[PDB]
Structure formats: C-alpha cells, structure tokens
RNA sequence: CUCCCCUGUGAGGAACUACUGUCUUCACGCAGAAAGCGUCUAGCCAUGGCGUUAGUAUGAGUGUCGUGCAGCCUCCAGGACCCCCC
RNA sequence: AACGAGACUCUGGCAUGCUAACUAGUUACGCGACCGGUCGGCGUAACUUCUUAGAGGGACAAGUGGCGU
C-alpha cells in the first residue's frame, strides 16, 4: 500500500559547508479522488455500515397495491 | 490380484513381533505392483509409518552421491535382488525382508552424555519406527560396503546381506553393527 | 389415525442437499441438487440394501446449486447457482441446452410455472428476474422488489389470475401479478430473514418461514393474514402436499407435518441414538420435497444424505 | 529375560541436545506395574517397546 | 459415446480420448507395452487390472502426452486412463458403476483421480538451489 | 502457527454485536453476510473475519461471551436463568440449630418457633490449623 | 502334595543303503574378535577412536568322504499344568 | 488506539462452469500414404477439455472427534 498511499521526495542543498540531503514523506488520506485521496482503501482498514433502523413488527398486515 | 513385480504374493507373509507389526508395511492393503509411488510420506509426522516396506528399502539405496537422484537404479536392483533370493532360500522373498528388518534393528542403543570430546554413553531403548529405520539403514550400508569392489552385483550382494541378516549370521554388516550397539548398551546400563 | 416411519437412506452425495424436486410424470425418479455442484438423478429401485441409486450427475456449475425444479414432463430441468448462473438442463442427454446470465450476485431461488413457459427467479442482488425458455430476459424489477436478498421464488398454480410470491431478508413477503409485471401485495408479519415461500395447488394457501421460527400461512387471493404456527429454531424448507392438505415444515433438528384444518402436528421426525456424538448439532434439514404420490417424502440433510419418510395409514 | 512394554503417556524429552523421549511404561503381561523409561527415536502413545533389561528405571540426562 | 480427459503430473500433460470401440488403448502411437521404462510397465496397467478387463472391453482410448519428464509421463497416462473411465461412466453409463469404478480406484491410490499440486520452486540468489546456499568462513 | 490478528477478532466482535440476528451457524452464510454488512478489502481478510463470526456464534449458543453484549442473548439468558423448583430449598419441617443460636432468637422473642431442632454442641475445641 | 499334556539325548528298536535336511574330513574364497601392548584426543583423565598383536583365535556356507545326526515307536526326564498358597 | 509482525504486491497449485482466439490447438470430414489403424502430412467447417489469460469463485482451523481455567 505504501506505494500508492505515500509520496517521498529526496534532495540536495549545496552550501559553503557541504551538501545537506533531505527527505520528505507525505501520506495522503482516503477515498474519492479530489486530485488527492487515492480510491482503494488500506487492506487492514475495516469499515462497518451502521444497521439501518428497521420497524419492529406488531401484527401481520397485508397491503394490496 | 496384487502381485509384486508380477510374480510375487504379498498376502502370505507373516510378522512374529508386536512392536514391528504396527509399522512394517505390505501385508493387508499397502501391497503394490511397483516400489515407486512418488507419494509424500514426509508430509506429516508418522505418515511415513504407512508407506510400503519394499519402497522403504528402495528409497535408501540411492544413499550415496552419484546414485543420489536416480531412483530407478534401485527398482532395477531391488528387482534382481528378490529374484536372486527366491533361488537360494526358496521362500517368499518378502519374508526375507521381514526377518532382516526384525533381526537387524537394534534393541537398546546408547545416547552420548558428557562434554564434547569425551564420549560417555548411557543405555536407552529403541522406538519401533527407529528400529525399522536404523535396520534398513544398516541393510543398505552393509550392501554398499560389501559391494564396493568385490566386483559383486549389488543385486547379488544385497541378496547376500539380506539372507544373512535374516538367518542371524555374523556375515551381515548389519547384524555386526547391531551387536556392537547392544554390547555397548551392556557396557553402560 | 396415521403414523410415520423411516423407510430408507440415500447416499449419492458428498455434500448438502440444497433443494429436492419431485414430479407427477415419473413417481419413480427424483432430482437432487447438492452442495457438491452436482445435480444427481435419483432412480428408485426399491430393493433391500438400497432404497435408491443415482443415475445422472450434471455439472454445468463452478459453484453450489441453490435450488432445482422440474418440468411437468420428464425431460427439462432448471438450476440456479451462486456463481450467478441459471441453467436449462436436459435430464435425458445430460447436457446444457440453454444458459441464463445477467445476475451480478448468487442465484438464490428459481420458480418454474405450471404452464411451463415462463421463468421467475430472485437473487442476492435484490432482483426478481423474468426469463424465457430461449435465455432472453424480459423485465427486471428493481422496484422495491426488496431491500435485501430474495431467498425464495414460487409460482402459484391456480385458476384465479396468476400470482408469483417472493420472500425477502427484509422480512417482507411480496405478491406480484404476471403480464402487468406489477407489485400487487406487501405482507409484513415477520421478525428476521425469510427463507422459503410455498404456494399450494389451491392457490389460496401460501406458507412462508424464516429465522423467527413461526410458520406463517397467508391467503393469496384475498390478501389476508390467515394462520400462525409456533415452532423452534429455523424454517429452512416448506412444501405443501398436493392431495393430503398437509403443510410440511423443515426445521434443522426436526421436520414437522402440520394438519391445517385441525391445527394438529402429525409427526415430528428426528432420529439419533448415539451417546458419544450427541454433543453435536443434529444435521439440519436443508430441503423438502413431496412427491405427487402423497405417501413418499424426500428430504435433504446437512448429513450429506437424502433420507425418505413413509406414511403408515391405519 | 526379554520383556514387552506398553506406552501409557508421553511426558517430556530428556537430552542434552534434546535426543531421548521420556515415556511411561505399562507391562503387556497384564500386570499393573508402572515404570518410566528412556526411548530413542519417534514415539507415539500405544506403541510397544521390547526391553532386554526389564528391571531398570529412568534417570534424568 | 465420446468423452475427453487430461492427466497432470508436474509439467507433464496427458490427453485421453474415449470413443466406443473394441478396447484399443494406445499412447501417442503405440500400445501400453512399448513405453520407455519397462520397469515402470506395471504402474500403467494398475487401474486396468484393478477395474477388470470387462469394463475396458467397450472403451477405445487414444492418448496424447507431451511435457515433463519420462517418469512423469507414465503417471500422466495413468491419470488419463483412470480419469477417463471415471468420467465416461458418468455420461454414457450409470452412477452406480461409476461408484464401483471409483470405490475400487480410490482405496488403492489417491493419485488416480487427483493430481499433486506440488511443482518446482524457484532457486534464489545466495544459493545453488531453492534453500541450499554457499559456504561461509570466519578466521 | 494459525492465529487471528487484532483486526480479525475485533472486527468479528463488532460485526456480531451489531448484526447478531442476521448471522447463522453456517460459514458461507455469514461469509456472504459480511460481504454486505461491512466493507472489507481483499479476500483472506473477509474469509477469516467471517470464520470468527461463526466460531464466536458456536461459543455464543453455549452461553455468555466475554467480548459481546446483545439484548437477544441477554433475553435468552433471562429465560435460562429464571428457574425455580416446585418448593423452596428454604422450606424444611426441621431445621437444626445450636443452643446459642436459640439464645439469640430468645432475645428477639422467637424462642417459640416450631420448626427448630436444638442439636448437641460439639465437645472438643479444635477449629484451628496445626501450625508448622 | 501330586498327575499328564507338550518340550529333551538318558536307554532300546525299525529305518539306517533308497528318502530328504544337519554335524565330521580336504580344496575354496568372504566377512573377522579380543586380554593386552603403544599412541592420539577430551584444559588435566579413557570409560573412547586409531595403530600393533593378525588378517591370528574364529563363524556362516559349497563340493568331497561319513556307514554318522536324525526324522517313525516306547519309556526315563524336563518343563506348561494343576493343586496349594494367597 | 498508532507504526513495526500480519494484512498487502509478485510467483506456483484448483476451475470438463464463464469470456474467447488463423499468431495455439482440438474434434469431425475430406484428400495423401503404407500395410480397420499408423503418420507433425495437406487442407476445411467444430469447439475450448488441452494451449494461452482475463473476469470472478475457492480456505475460513472449515466440518467431525480428542487435549485445553
């Protein structure tokens, strides 16, 4: 996942003293692409949809339409 | 009917010991036509308890380097060895494998105790599977050492070492190393 | 004045029996679709050692076959399967004449009409599909057909205007009218998912059952709640007797033959005598089939067997 | 005398290098005598061991 | 009257074609007894002698085998003919006689109707073989 | 060694706790239940979680599970627990009692109770464990 | 304190030559030991390996001579039995 | 609760169910040959078991029985 989920950049600054190399690692959040948020989710992540509220039955009812 | 190498009969043979009756194969079902089944008996623990005994003698005959990968060398050699055996003793050659296994296997054996370089052994006793295995080892190794250069066929020399391992003579390299093990077992106790 | 006895046991199968389908045209043969991907053709030789012996094992499926129904004639059969494929089988040549696709989920149930040109199926895609004998799909109902899976679909063989009854996991039993492709009724009695809907040859009595454990008998023509039967565990299968007016409920541990006029449970069918394996769950009853004969019962199990029941009349 | 023996239980593995198995011995003579014993190679319960010295007892390596 | 199967062992593939006939069974243009190891003769007729000759009297199998090694190919023809007489008995015969054939072939060798999934692993760097490695030395 | 990740067991815990009515003791049943109820990537995750939902149900029908609270098994354990024998175990025609207990009752004017039976005091005094 | 089923080698017979299998004697090749004596190795130390005793002392088998050993009948015994002791 | 372990990607094993193939073959029918077959010999329709490679199924310690607070 780290392939599509994060972005790494390495550079060299050139100064009197020498060169300083640098690394910047950035991680993107999840879901639909806004130019960010790569669609496919972490293989670990498990999302549970909350149960849609269901009417508790009282007495049998038959409705013809 | 199931006939070994086309001319033998497996179901008529007999086992005289209870320890080796539960392990040694080719009596009831396991009897096959040919030794090479290319099955996996090293898959799980004691799954190699159930593979055909003739195949077991077969597997151990490749045991030195140049012969290693070539299995068929053995199902050749085990072929002519049996057909030789029947000519000498005149009994079911698969009775001769049973008796050689039973007699060649150790009984008691020594386990090395001490610090490295000083061998001081204590006597313990062999497990049935271990008995079978060590026995067959002894058979194949006795055959090799005996057949290196006498210009004997390994067919001839294994029939030799097998019949001799069956009778109980000191001719067999097998019975020799066994007798040493048991004697060291006596030394310690 | 009647009792019931265990006649014989049928092993053709390496897995569960999902649905059993009998036929009037041949009281001798049965069709058993199983968890092993196989549709086995059962020949009854009625001998001493074996009550029946398998004839034709049909493999068109990469997956389990959920339900099977036969034509009124001894040739054609039909099979739904979870790989998402419905199929038209020839029991005579043992090959597949027609294939039905266009389901994106498992095919949970399929119903063949009394007129033998129509197909009405329902699926875990929450779809009720209308199929033609040549493979072509007519009308797809997304209408609120259900908010959950369709577990069973059954035709109604009645003289009054034709009706198809489907039961969902959303606890609704829905009634639909053919040729208008319309939703004519909503039946809500239930707690928990629905498993099977059956429709008597009368057309008047339809039975539905589910996790609630209570058999619900509904009136199809009038659209009125009729009766409520109390019982344990899960109703897996329900089948009506053509001539005996008996509603046979299939629950996992026990099968219950109900007499609907007197509200009397006729016989409760369970047998296990063993003390060592008694800690186990008794093998469930997956399906139920009533032969057109009325004397012979054919039931599938989680024991990967087909056990049959015979009626002792006094 | 030569005797026979039965495996009642497997307890642990005795050894420097973890060689021997330490197993429990019933006598096949239908006697109830119970002796612990050291055995080499693979052992599963129920097996029969042949003892050349049958009065000997097990020590910890 | 026609049924087709395939045997598999390692890289060796067999293809068995079963038609109604006199009982002729040939492999890539030659009978059962012309095959390369003659030592391995008896492993080839194993289902035959197990199934009886009567059930092969009405079955003509032409077998085409390419791939793998010599030994593997005989396991391949074994597989092909066994799977052939089980899969033919389904379509053109009843399931009772297929159960007879199967109960006879299964209790002897499980490799008759099944194949061994196992096939060669990949040797990787740092060693001569799959696991096996190069020597190392201190001092 | 086959052992379930935190993911597996936590997920099957919450799935069971919310959806307890929809699950059943069959594997593929709840496998297809969880392909819907939750959103899981891949396969080997899905299958494992479902396996644990199942396993956990086979432990639920036995009795109370440490991880989950459902009102349905609270209610079935309200049935199971509620019990009573035809008569109480607190009803005996003769209940035996020590002289002093009789004294303490005599303080409360209950020395008139019928059911009592005064039993002989024990003569030795050793209630104590022999230290060492 | 026994009696009577099977094992032995103690005495009488047939057989023994023809029957078969084993111990005698000669040519044959194959494995093949030790008491010890030395050496090496375990930090020091053989209870081990290796050298020399020696390819000795031996034993398993194939072909020669046995007038053998037998196998078939009896007992004299020895053990399983019983009892008995518990 | 978070990273590391796992999950994940890459490879092998399953599919006589699906999607198909003249740049892979199969079955069938012709011609060809030598004594009904044998043939990598030559061409046409038949299809996917072989041969490929996509989709998606399949295994989750699952089922039963033992050791386990």
UniProtKB/Swiss-Prot annotation, chain B:
Q: Which UniProt keywords apply?
A: Acetylation, Cytoplasm, Isopeptide bond, Nucleus, Phosphoprotein, Ribonucleoprotein, Ribosomal protein, Ubl conjugation
Subcellular localization(s) per the UniProt record? Cytoplasm; Nucleus, Nucleolus
Which spans of this chain does the record mark as coiled coil?
Answer: none
Does Acetylation appear among the keywords?
yes
**What are this entry's molecular-function GO terms?**
mRNA binding; RNA binding; rRNA binding; structural constituent of ribosome
Kindly report the protein's main subcellular placement as a broad class. Answer: cytoplasm
Q: Which InterPro entries match?
A: Ribosomal_uS7 (IPR000235), Ribosomal_uS7_CS (IPR020606), Ribosomal_uS7_dom (IPR023798), Ribosomal_uS7_dom_sf (IPR036823), Ribosomal_uS7_euk/arc (IPR005716)
Give the top-rank taxon of the lineage listed in the UniProt record for this protein.
Answer: Eukaryota
Q: Keyword Phosphoprotein: yes or no?
A: yes
Any one GO CC term of the record: extracellular exosome
Q: Which residues carry this modification: Phosphoserine?
A: 127
- Residue(s) carrying N6-acetyllysine: 32
The biological process GO terms on file are: cytoplasmic translation; regulation of translational fidelity; ribosomal small subunit assembly; ribosomal small subunit biogenesis; translation; translational initiation
The UniProt record lists the Glycyl lysine isopeptide (Lys-Gly) (interchain with G-Cter in SUMO2) crosslink at: 32
The record's subunit annotation is: Component of the small ribosomal subunit. Part of the small subunit (SSU) processome, composed of more than 70 proteins and the RNA chaperone small nucleolar RNA (snoRNA) U3.
Recorded family membership:
Belongs to the universal ribosomal protein uS7 family.
User: What name has this protein been given in UniProt?
Assistant: Small ribosomal subunit protein uS7
**Organism per entry:** Homo sapiens (Human)
Q: Which gene encodes it?
A: RPS5
Swiss-Prot record, chain D:
Q: Write out the entry's keywords from A to Z.
A: Acetylation, Cytoplasm, Diamond-Blackfan anemia, Endoplasmic reticulum, Nucleus, Phosphoprotein, Ribonucleoprotein, Ribosomal protein
GO CC annotation, single: synapse
Q: What GO terms describe the biological role, i.e. biological process, of this protein?
A: cytoplasmic translation; maturation of SSU-rRNA; ribosomal small subunit assembly; ribosomal small subunit biogenesis; ribosome biogenesis; rRNA processing; translation
Location(s) in or outside the cell = Cytoplasm, Cytosol; Cytoplasm; Rough endoplasmic reticulum; Nucleus, Nucleolus
A GO term, aspect molecular function: structural constituent of ribosome
- Give all Phosphoserine modified positions: 34
Which InterPro entries does this one have?
A: NA-bd_OB-fold (IPR012340), Ribosomal_eS28 (IPR000289), Ribosomal_eS28_CS (IPR028626)
Domain of life the protein comes from: Eukaryota
* Subunit: Component of the 40S small ribosomal subunit. Part of the small subunit (SSU) processome, composed of more than 70 proteins and the RNA chaperone small nucleolar RNA (snoRNA) U3.
Q: Which disease is it linked to?
A: Diamond-Blackfan anemia 15, with mandibulofacial dysostosis: A form of Diamond-Blackfan anemia, a congenital non-regenerative hypoplastic anemia that usually presents early in infancy. Diamond-Blackfan anemia is characterized by a moderate to severe macrocytic anemia, erythroblastopenia, and an increased risk of malignancy. 30 to 40% of Diamond-Blackfan anemia patients present with short stature and congenital anomalies, the most frequent being craniofacial (Pierre-Robin syndrome and cleft palate), thumb and urogenital anomalies.
Swiss-Prot record, chain E:
UniProt function note: Component of the small ribosomal subunit. The ribosome is a large ribonucleoprotein complex responsible for the synthesis of proteins in the cell. Part of the small subunit (SSU) processome, first precursor of the small eukaryotic ribosomal subunit. During the assembly of the SSU processome in the nucleolus, many ribosome biogenesis factors, an RNA chaperone and ribosomal proteins associate with the nascent pre-rRNA and work in concert to generate RNA folding, modifications, rearrangements and cleavage as well as targeted degradation of pre-ribosomal RNA by the RNA exosome.
Q: What is its main location?
A: cytoplasm
Origin superkingdom:
Eukaryota
Provide the Gene Ontology terms for cellular component: cytoplasm; cytosol; cytosolic ribosome; cytosolic small ribosomal subunit; extracellular exosome; focal adhesion; membrane; nucleolus
> Can you say where in the cell this protein is located?
Cytoplasm; Nucleus, Nucleolus
Q: Which GO terms describe its molecular function?
A: RNA binding; structural constituent of ribosome
Q: Please give the organism.
A: Homo sapiens (Human)
Matches recorded under Gene3D superfamilies: 3.30.230.10
Q: State the name under which the record lists this protein.
A: Small ribosomal subunit protein uS9
Swiss-Prot record, chain F:
**Which processes are annotated in GO (biological process)?**
cytoplasmic translation; erythrocyte homeostasis; ribosomal small subunit biogenesis; rRNA processing; translation; translational initiation
The UniProt entry lists the main location of this chain as: cytoplasm
**Residues bearing Phosphothreonine?**
129
- List residues of cross-link (Glycyl lysine isopeptide (Lys-Gly) (interchain with G-Cter in SUMO2)): 102
Localization per Swiss-Prot or TrEMBL: Cytoplasm; Nucleus, Nucleolus
Which Gene Ontology MF annotations are present? RNA binding; structural constituent of ribosome
Which residues are annotated as modified residue Phosphoserine in the UniProt record?
A: 112
Its GO CC terms are: cytoplasm; cytosol; cytosolic ribosome; cytosolic small ribosomal subunit; focal adhesion; membrane; nucleolus; nucleoplasm
As stated in the Swiss-Prot or TrEMBL entry, residues carrying the post-translational modification N6-succinyllysine are: 18
Placement of covalent cross-link Glycyl lysine isopeptide (Lys-Gly) (interchain with G-Cter in SUMO1): 102
* Keywords, comma-separated and alphabetical: Cytoplasm, Diamond-Blackfan anemia, Isopeptide bond, Nucleus, Phosphoprotein, Ribonucleoprotein, Ribosomal protein, Ubl conjugation
Quaternary structure and interacting proteins, as annotated: Component of the small ribosomal subunit. Part of the small subunit (SSU) processome, composed of more than 70 proteins and the RNA chaperone small nucleolar RNA (snoRNA) U3.
PANTHER family noted in UniProt: 40S RIBOSOMAL PROTEIN S17
Name the family the entry cites.
Belongs to the eukaryotic ribosomal protein eS17 family.
Protein name according to UniProt: Small ribosomal subunit protein eS17
């Amino acid at each position: 996942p780290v392939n599509y989920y994060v972005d790494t950049a390495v550079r060299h600054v050139l100064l009197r003293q020498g060169v300083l190399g640098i690394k910047v690692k950035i991680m993107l959040p999840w879901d639909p692409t806004g130019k960010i948020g790569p669609k496919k989710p972490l293989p670990d992540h498990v999302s549970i949809v909350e149960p849609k509220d269901e009417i508790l039955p009282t007495t049998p009812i038959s409705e013809q339409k | 009917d199931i006939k070994l190498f086309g001319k033998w009969s497996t179901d008529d043979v007999q086992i005289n010991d209870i320890s080796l009756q539960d392990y040694i194969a080719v009596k009831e079902k396991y009897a096959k036509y040919l030794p090479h089944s290319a099955g996996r008996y090293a898959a799980k623990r004691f799954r190699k308890a159930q593979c055909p005994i003739v195949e077991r003698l077969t597997n151990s005959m490749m045991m030195h380097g140049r012969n290693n990968g070539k299995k068929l060398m053995t199902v050749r050699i085990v072929k002519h060895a049996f057909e030789i055996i029947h000519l000498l003793t005149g009994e079911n050659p698969l009775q001769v494998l049973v008796n050689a296994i039973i007699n060649s296997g150790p009984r008691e054996d020594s386990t090395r105790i001490g610090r490295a370089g000083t061998v001081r052994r204590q006597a313990v006793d062999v497990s049935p599977l271990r008995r079978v295995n060590q026995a067959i080892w002894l058979l194949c190794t006795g055959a090799r050492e005996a057949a290196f250069r006498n210009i004997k066929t390994i067919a001839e020399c294994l029939a030799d070492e097998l019949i001799n391992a069956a009778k109980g003579s000191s001719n067999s390299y097998a019975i020799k190393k066994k007798d040493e093990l048991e004697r060291v077992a006596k030394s310690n106790r | 004045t009647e009792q019931m006895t265990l006649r014989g046991t049928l092993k053709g199968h390496n897995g569960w029996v999902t649905q059993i389908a009998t036929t009037p045209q041949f009281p001798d043969m049965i069709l058993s679709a199983s968890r092993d991907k196989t549709i086995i053709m059962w020949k009854l030789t009625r001998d001493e050692t074996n009550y029946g012996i398998p004839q034709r094992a049909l493999r068109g499926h990469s997956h389990f076959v959920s339900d099977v129904v036969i034509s009124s004639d001894g040739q054609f059969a039909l099979s739904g399967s979870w790989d998402g494929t419905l199929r038209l089988w020839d029991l005579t040549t043992g090959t597949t004449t027609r294939r039905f696709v266009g389901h994106t989920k498992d095919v949970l149930s399929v119903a063949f009409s009394s007129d033998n040109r129509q197909i009405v199926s329902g699926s875990r895609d929450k779809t009720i599909k209308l199929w033609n004998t040549l493979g072509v799909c007519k009308y797809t109902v997304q209408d609120e057909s259900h908010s959950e899976w369709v577990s069973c679909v059954r035709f109604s063989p009645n003289s009054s205007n034709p009706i198809i009854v489907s039961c969902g996991w959303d606890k609704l039993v829905k009634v639909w009218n053919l040729a208008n492709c319309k939703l004519k009724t909503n039946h809500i009695g239930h707690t928990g998912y629905l498993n099977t809907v059956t429709v008597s040859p009368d057309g008047s009595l339809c039975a539905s059952g589910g996790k609630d454990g209570q058999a619900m008998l509904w009136d199809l023509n009038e659209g009125k709640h009729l009766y409520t039967l109390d019982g344990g565990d899960i109703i897996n299968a329900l089948c009506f007797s053509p001539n005996r007016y008996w509603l046979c409920a299939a629950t996992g541990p026990s099968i219950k033959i109900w007499d609907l006029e007197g509200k009397i449970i006729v016989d409760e069918l369970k047998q296990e005598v063993i003390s060592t394996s008694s800690k186990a769950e008794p093998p469930q009853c997956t399906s139920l089939a009533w032969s057109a004969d009325g004397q012979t019962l054919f039931a599938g199990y989680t024991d990967n067997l087909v056990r049959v029941w015979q009626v002792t009349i006094g | 005398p030569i005797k026979l023996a039965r495996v009642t239980k497997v307890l642990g593995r005795t050894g420097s290098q973890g060689q021997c198995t330490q197993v429990r011995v019933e006598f096949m003579d239908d006697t109830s005598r119970s002796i612990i014993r050291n055995v080499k190679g693979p052992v599963r319960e129920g097996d029969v061991l042949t003892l050349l010295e049958s009065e000997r007892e097990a020590r910890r390596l | 009257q026609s049924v087709q199967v395939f045997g598999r062992k390692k890289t060796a593939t067999a293809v068995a074609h079963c038609k109604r006939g006199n009982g002729l069974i040939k492999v890539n243009g030659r009978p059962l007894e012309m095959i390369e190891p003659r030592t391995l003769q008896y492993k080839l007729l194993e289902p035959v002698l197990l199934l009886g000759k009567e059930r092969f009297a009405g079955v003509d199998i032409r077998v085409r085998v390419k791939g793998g090694g010599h030994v593997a190919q005989i396991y391949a023809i074994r597989q092909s003919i066994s799977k052939a007489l089980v899969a033919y008995y389904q379509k053109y015969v009843d399931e009772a006689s297929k159960k007879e054939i199967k109960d006879i072939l299964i209790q002897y060798d499980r490799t008759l109707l099944v194949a061994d999934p196992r096939r060669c692993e990949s040797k990787k760097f740092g060693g001569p073989g799959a696991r096996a490695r190069y020597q190392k030395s201190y001092r | 060694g086959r052992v379930r990740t935190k993911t597996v067991k936590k997920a099957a815990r919450v799935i069971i706790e919310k959806y307890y009515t929809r699950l059943g003791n069959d594997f593929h049943t709840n496998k297809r239940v969880c392909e819907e109820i939750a959103i899981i990537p891949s396969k080997k995750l899905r299958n494992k979680i479902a396996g644990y939902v199942t396993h956990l149900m086979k432990r639920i029908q036995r009795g109370p599970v440490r991880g989950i609270s459902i009102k349905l098994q609270e209610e079935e354990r309200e049935r199971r627990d509620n019990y009573v024998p035809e008569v109480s175990a607190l009803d005996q025609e003769i209940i035996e009692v020590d002289p002093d207990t009789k004294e303490m009752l005599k303080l409360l004017d209950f020395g008139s109770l019928s059911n009592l039976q005064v039993t002989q005091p024990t003569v030795g005094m050793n209630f104590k464990t022999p230290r060492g």
